[PDB]
Amino acid sequence: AGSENIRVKNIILSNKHDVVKPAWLLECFKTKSFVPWQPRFMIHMCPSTKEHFAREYDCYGDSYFIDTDL
Amino acid sequence: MERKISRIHLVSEPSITHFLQVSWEKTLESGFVITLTDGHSAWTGTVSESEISQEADDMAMEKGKYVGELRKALLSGAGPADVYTFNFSKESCYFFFEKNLKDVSFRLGSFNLEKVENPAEVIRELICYCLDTIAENQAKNEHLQKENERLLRDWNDVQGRFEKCVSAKEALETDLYKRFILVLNEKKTKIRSLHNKLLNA
Amino acid sequence: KEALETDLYKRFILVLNEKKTKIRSLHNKLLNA
């Protein structure tokens, strides 16, 4: 879901599915491979994804171990 | 005591131009003293509130309009609206001014002046007043020009300062962001080093 | 300029504080194991 429509608000308030920006999809079709999920594209995190990323990335999109650019 | 001078071309002697000086204390409505000069002889007269009221009543029109027309005619403030003609009998001191239009003449105002024994005093007074006004106007003009030059210099300086500010605005952010990147990279290096050391156990 | 500076510095201090908490928490486990 790209636009935050009423359906997107309802699904994100559900707290059972993770929303991913369309941009990631575009990247997936440019490298001809599967791009690992990163906070830059996610709009929401499921409880499992939240737990996984708690020790891997900040509450924001900042990086933990890999360096960051402009 | 506010006075104003004006030039008039009498119908009797159009070639020679005369000077009329009208002075009033608070406003032209309360009354005014008129002095007519030509360089050889001078005449003096006064108009009080009663005379102006009589003129307005005889003319049968609003007092404000009469005052405005009289001020315009005497002070030479008229533009192309109309042409005012002034007559003055030197042997009777019966001055009067009217306005001409479409071959129609209406007696606007009339006064009975009085000759002065010595015109030298009044001529000297008028010339001294004119010279003092000229000097004061020159002084004010010079001071205002100096102030304007100062203001222009200040405007140039502030414009240059604004240009410097806008130029440095983006450089500030660029330096801030690159410094942020450096510090974050150092902290991430430290974090990964500690993580490796901890997992070594 | 002042508004931009304060906003950027608030974001900076927030991020740095989060990183400081992370480093402190990670170091705390060294003594335990």
Q: Identify the H or E element spanning B201.
A: none
Please tell me the distance from the alpha carbon of residue B173 to that of residue B114, in angstroms, as a whole number: 85
Which positions in chain A touch C19 (Cβ < 8 Å)? Answer: 58, 62
Contact status, residue B19 vs residue B38, Cβ threshold 8 Å: yes
Residue B61's φ and ψ, nearest 5 degrees, are -155, 175
Header resolution in angstroms: 3.1
Q: In terms of Cα–Cα distance, which of B191, A34, B17 is closest to C27? A: B191
Please tell me the distance from the alpha carbon of residue B65 to that of residue B69, in angstroms, as a whole number: 6
Please tell me the distance from the alpha carbon of residue A35 to that of residue A26, in angstroms, as a whole number: 10
Q: In terms of Cα–Cα distance, which of B85, B88, B79, B86 is closest to B103? A: B85
Angle at C31 between CA C29 and CA C33, to 5 degrees: 65
Q: Whole-angstrom distance between the N-terminal and C-terminal Cα of chain C? A: 48
Centre a 10 Å sphere on the Cβ of residue C7 and count the other Cβ atoms it contains. Answer: 10
Contact status of B183 with chain C (Cβ, < 8 Å): yes
Residues 141-180 of chain B whose Cβ lies under 8 A from any Cβ of chain C: 165, 169, 172-173, 176, 180
Number of helices (H), then strands (E), in chain B: 3, 8
Please tell me the distance from the alpha carbon of residue A7 to that of residue B72, in angstroms, as a whole number: 80
Q: Which residue type sits at B37?
A: T
Q: Output the six-digit token pair for A56.
A: 């891997």
Give the residue on A whose Cα is nearest the Cα of C18: A58
Please tell me the distance from the alpha carbon of residue A69 to that of residue A65, in angstroms, as a whole number: 13
Please tell me the distance from the alpha carbon of residue C27 to that of residue B193, in angstroms, as a whole number: 11
Chain C residues with CB within 8 Å of chain A CB: 15, 18-19, 22
**C-alpha distances in Å from residue B33, one per residue of A13, B21, B49, B144:** 92, 8, 12, 34
* CB contact (8 A) between residue B184 and residue C27: no
Angle at A26 between CA A22 and CA A30, to 5 degrees: 165
Query: From the CA of A50, how many Å to the nearest CA of chain B?
Result: 21
Q: In terms of Cα–Cα distance, which of B83, B84, B66 is closest to B29? A: B66
Give the residue on C whose Cα is nearest the Cα of B191: C23
B168-171: which pairs have CB atoms within 8 A and are 24 or more residues apart?
A: B169/C1
DSSP string of B63-127, one letter each residue: HHHHHHHHHHHHTT---SS-EEEEEEETTTTEEEEEEE-SS-EEEEEEEE-EE-S-HHHHHHHHH
SS3 at position B18: strand
Please tell me the distance from the alpha carbon of residue B49 to that of residue B31, in angstroms, as a whole number: 5
Contact status, residue A53 vs residue C12, Cβ threshold 8 Å: no
Contact status of B197 with chain C (Cβ, < 8 Å): yes
Query: From the CA of A59, how many Å to the nearest CA of chain B?
Result: 16
The β-bridge relationship of strands B105-112 and B114-115 is unpaired
By 3-state DSSP, what share of chain B in percent is helix, strand and coil, each rounded to 5? 50, 25, 20
Question: What kind of experiment solved this structure?
Answer: cryo-EM
SS3 at position B13: coil
Contact status, residue A46 vs residue A17, Cβ threshold 8 Å: yes
Which positions in chain A touch B178 (Cβ < 8 Å)? Answer: 70
Query: From the CA of A8, how many Å to the nearest CA of chain B?
Result: 34
Q: Which residues contact C3 (CB under 8 A, 6 or more apart)?
A: none
Rounded to whole angstroms, the maximal C-alpha distance in chain A is 37
Chain A residues with CB within 8 Å of chain B CB: 62-70
SS3 per-residue string spanning B22-42: EEECCCCCCEEEEEEECCCCE
Classify the C-alpha dihedral A47-A50-A54-A59 as positive or negative. negative
Q: Which residues contact B99 (CB under 8 A, 6 or more apart)?
A: B69, B73, B82, B83, B84, B85, B105, B106, B108
Q: Identify the H or E element spanning A60.
A: none
**C-alpha distances in Å from residue B180, one per residue of B31, B103, B170:** 82, 90, 15
Q: In terms of Cα–Cα distance, which of A18, C11, C31, A57 is closest to B201? A: C31
Contact status, residue B34 vs residue B45, Cβ threshold 8 Å: yes
Q: Which residues contact C5 (CB under 8 A, 6 or more apart)?
A: B172
